[PDB]
Each structure stands twice: as structure tokens, then as C-alpha cells.
């Protein structure tokens, strides 16, 4: 099994780079968490659902967790740490 693929993306023209796939946004730029991401890349880490137009919450791990999940993971009873 061979694995190799370069990423032709060095130059930049008044465009933001997706903080998910590391690609230059040209079609549409979705502002989230201060940074810029693709309107399709932005998704949950657990359920992996599109959060393009819905509330969410992140953590130290930087793993955007949809309110629901976050409420089912973090809010799963008495926890501390
Ligand atoms: Zn992307
Ligand atoms: Zn989720």
C-alpha cells in the first residue's frame, strides 16, 4: 500500500485557508470560532453533523461538540477534572 499526495497551496490571494482540510477557500468562507472554515468541513467530532447554521460548543481539546452531544458527553452526571 502506497501513500503520497502533495498539496499545491502556498500562495494566497485575499483568501482565508480552511482550518480543517488546510485548503484555500474560494467558493464560500464560513466564519466560525474566529477562524475561517469551509461551509461543509465544519462538522461535529462525535456525531459528525453539519453545524453550518446551528449553535455549538468547543473545549480544550478543540473538538467542536454539538450542543446535544456536548450535553450528553459533558453533562452525563457528576464529573470533575
Ligand atoms: Zn475545508
Ligand atoms: Zn455531535
UniProtKB/Swiss-Prot annotation:
Assembly notes: Specifically interacts with the ligand binding domain of the thyroid receptor (TR) in the presence of thyroid hormone. Interacts (via the third LIM domain and C-terminus) with PTPN13 (via the second PDZ domain). Interacts (via the second LIM domain or via the third LIM domain plus C-terminus) with PDLIM4 (via PDZ domain). Found in a complex with PTPN13 and PDLIM4. Interacts with SVIL isoform 2. Interacts with LPAR2 but not other LPA receptors. Interacts with PRKAA2. Interacts with MAGI1. Interacts with SCRIB. In case of infection, interacts with S.typhimurium protein sseI.
Role summary: Relays signals from the cell surface to the nucleus to weaken adherens junction and promote actin cytoskeleton reorganization and cell invasiveness. Involved in lysophosphatidic acid-induced cell adhesion and migration. Acts as a transcriptional coactivator for NF-kappa-B and JUN, and mediates the transrepression of these transcription factors induced by glucocorticoid receptor.
Domain LIM zinc-binding residues, every copy: 18-75
Portion of the full sequence shown: 329 to 396 of 476
Full protein name: Thyroid receptor-interacting protein 6
Family, similarity comment: Belongs to the zyxin/ajuba family.
Compartments, as annotated in UniProt: Cytoplasm, Cytoskeleton; Cell junction, Focal adhesion; Nucleus; Cytoplasm
Transmembrane intervals: none
Note on domains (UniProt): The LIM zinc-binding domains mediate interaction with LPAR2 and with S.typhimurium protein sseI.
The gene coding this protein: TRIP6
Tissue-by-tissue expression: Abundantly expressed in kidney, liver and lung. Lower levels in heart, placenta and pancreas. Expressed in colonic epithelial cells. Up-regulated in colonic tumors.
Amino acid at each position: 500500500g502506497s501513500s503520497g499526495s502533495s498539496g499545491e497551496g502556498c500562495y494566497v490571494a485575499t483568501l482565508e485557508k480552511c482550518a480543517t482540510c488546510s485548503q484555500p477557500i474560494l467558493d464560500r468562507i464560513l466564519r466560525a470560532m474566529g477562524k475561517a472554515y469551509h461551509p461543509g468541513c465544519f462538522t461535529c467530532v462525535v456525531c459528525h453533523r453539519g453545524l453550518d447554521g446551528i449553535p455549538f460548543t468547543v473545549d480544550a481539546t478543540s473538538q467542536i461538540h454539538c450542543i446535544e452531544d456536548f450535553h450528553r458527553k459533558f453533562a452525563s452526571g457528576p464529573s470533575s477534572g
